[PDB]
């Protein structure tokens, strides 16, 4: 609703060719703050955002210890998953998983998550009520009772409702000014000379945060879809994000167009128009 | 902060 925190897991078995490899990344909204790579002789959780560095030794050890155990466990999980699907040792397989907690504009838990995939496909995920599971197939059903029997739900719920939000709130206060900065876009629109027909009008949105933004071109308050070429949102490499829609349609009367781009970094929805 | 997995938490 407002802020969120997720963790991402991969457990990849190298085609019959060795022990599996466990990775974990910590996300707050879109900022990445910790990473953990199984592959090394002295694996350890590492900072990724400046505001996590202040955290103490015991915290880094609690992380390192869980991802170190997860490493061990997920190998046995990979051995059980492949066993279900009668896959051979060689043998390139992957289980990914993302859980976390959602904060509203107030600062309380809106909902939590614990989904899984195996080999890129939805497997088992926690229902909104934080009590029930959803299995993909008869195999993910085998995993569901494994998990009901161990009451995993009741404990993910205790983490979601408790610790998770707890820490979210914590980081939030610590990395505020970057986490609660909300930077607006430097917008404009341009065109190249040698195009198909008329100006290659390009609606731009740059250096903004977070990623939430909306473009759409109009014919005096309109919604095109078919007449505008849109592009997906990318990072600027420096925490900021980018995105553009555009128009190069065969008809061009030049000065008579709008591009309503609204974002939580604006005091109002922007109307835009360029002058040579 | 990462949740910790208890025993018998495998797939």
């Amino acid at each position, epitope marked *: 609703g407002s802020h969120s925190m997720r963790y991402f897991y991969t457990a990849m078995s190298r085609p019959g060719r060795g022990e599996p490899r466990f990775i974990a990344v910590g996300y707050v909204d879109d900022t990445q703050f910790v990473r953990f790579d199984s592959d090394a002789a002295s694996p350890r959780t590492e900072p990724r955002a400046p505001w996590i560095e202040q955290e103490g030794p015991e915290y880094w050890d609690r992380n390192t210890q869980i991802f170190k155990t*997860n490493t061990q*466990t997920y190998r046995e999980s990979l051995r059980n998953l492949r066993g279900y699907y009668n896959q051979s040792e060689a043998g390139s397989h992957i289980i990914q998983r993302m859980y976390g907690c959602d904060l509203g504009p107030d600062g309380r838990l809106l909902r939590g998550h614990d989904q899984s995939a195996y080999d890129g496909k939805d497997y088992i995920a926690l229902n909104e009520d934080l009590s029930s599971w959803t299995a993909a197939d008869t195999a993910a059903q085998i995993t569901q009772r494994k998990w009901e029997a161990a009451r995993v739900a009741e404990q993910l719920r205790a*983490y979601l409702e408790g610790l998770c939000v707890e820490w979210l709130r914590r980081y939030l206060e610590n990395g505020k000014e970057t986490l609660q900065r909300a930077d607006p876009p430097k917008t404009h629109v341009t065109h190249h000379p040698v195009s198909d027909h008329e100006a290659t009008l390009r609606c731009w949105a740059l250096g903004f945060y977070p990623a939430e933004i909306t473009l759409t071109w109009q014919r005096d308050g309109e919604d095109q879809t078919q007449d505008t070429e849109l592009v997906e949102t990318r990072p600027a490499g420096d925490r900021t994000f980018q995105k553009w829609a555009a128009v190069v349609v065969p008809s061009g009367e030049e000065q008579r167009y709008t591009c309503h781009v609204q974002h939580e970094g604006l005091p109002k929805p922007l109307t835009l128009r360029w002058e040579p | 902060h990462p949740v910790g997995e208890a*025993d018998y938490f495998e797939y």
Partner: T-cell receptor
Amino acid sequence: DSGVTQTPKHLITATGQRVTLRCSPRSGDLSVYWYQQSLDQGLQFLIAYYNGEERAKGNILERFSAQQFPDLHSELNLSSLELGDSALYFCASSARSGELFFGEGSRLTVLE
Amino acid sequence: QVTQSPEALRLQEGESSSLNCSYTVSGLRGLFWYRQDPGKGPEFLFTLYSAGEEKEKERLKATLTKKESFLHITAPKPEDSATYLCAVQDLGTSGSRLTFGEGTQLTVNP
């Protein structure tokens, strides 16, 4: 009579000695949690195994060691005994919901 | 990291009383109350999971708060003579390990 099976219940040995406490988990439990309670002190977590397979490490000493064998039974070995080793060692078998089912403990008396 | 309050406890048969247990934890996986007699190893009485949870049970009632748990014994009979243990689990560590309190030694004068 929980399910865990500890032996030997009583051991008496000389300093600088070695002994080894057995333990068998509740049928159907795969873990083994070793504990030490020093007469009139608290229960301190020692070490813990899952299926193989060393799963956690409390405050076992450089000098003590243990394993969990193929079946599931554990063996904790206590080398170079000191007088202040004398105590009760409680093995436990977790699961699945997952309470810890303890054994009848085995009492170690180490003498000069 | 788990302390139990009345270390020693000395009650007349019939005299109710609540044994305290404090806890500091990252996130609480579980709180357990065990009963230990001399010689034998800890028996299971209760698990409590969420702040506000209570469990039966016979003369013993168990209670959980944010900061601690309470085992209220009603009308203690002499055979309730044992030392009583308190243990937590924590969502911040993997596995099922317990950290135990020191223990409350209860003696019911008949």
